[PDB]
Amino acid sequence: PGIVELPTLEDLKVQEVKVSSSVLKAAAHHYGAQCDKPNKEFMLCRWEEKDPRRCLEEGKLVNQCALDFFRQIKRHCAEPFTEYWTCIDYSGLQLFRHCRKQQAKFDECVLDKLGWVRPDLGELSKVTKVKTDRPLPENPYHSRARPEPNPEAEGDLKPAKHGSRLFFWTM
């Protein structure tokens, strides 16, 4: 029943972020603080549309924004960031606790150069509001029309006509 529609492979082509997980974790806090708007727009669109095929443009936007963030980091603070992500990468669990020293060096360097303030505890987990011009989907579940309910008639009760009417019982 019906034919599924899938975007062509040219619609899924984008400049991928080719850094490993440890590199992403090293700059996760600054990436969340700086690149927040496209990420939040994409995630709100994903939760409202309930369809991967309706959120390709926001995915391309978030990829581009992440690439811009990493290009800035590469331009200004390449070496402290390299040391920080190397240390994060060495550990099996990739713990922030291991080398707070390299993290402090990277934070002070990036605050000196680009003036970035690392988000404090309990800030990246906040719920926020997004101002977007995308119309609110009116029926994202593609539901049908609900069947009509029962008549649920009403009135005033009256005594049963001629009693029980069960065989010979007159009451």
Ligand X SMILES: CCCCCCCCCCCCCCCCCC(=O)OC[C@H](COP(=O)([O-])OCC(O)COP(=O)([O-])OC[C@@H](COC(=O)CCCCCCCCCCCCCCCCC)OC(=O)CCCCCCCCCCCCCCCCC)OC(=O)CCCCCCCCCCCCCCCCC
Nearer to another protein, 87 or 109 (CB): 87
Nearer to another protein, 1 or 155 (CB): 1
Positive or negative, the CA dihedral 113, 71, 32, 136 is: positive
122 near another protein, rule: CB under 8 A: yes
Applying the rule CB under 8 A, the residues between 39 and 78 that interact with another protein are: 39-40, 42-44, 46-48, 50-53, 55-56, 58-59, 62-63, 66
E strand or H helix at 28: helix 28-34
90 binds, among another protein, ligand X, none (CB under 5 to 8 A by kind): another protein
Give ∠ CA 91-118-63 in degrees, rounded to 5: 75
Nearer to ligand X, 141 or 169 (CB): 169
144 near another protein, rule: CB under 8 A: yes
Contacts 24+ apart (CB under 8 A), 146-153: none
CA distance 88 to 110: 18
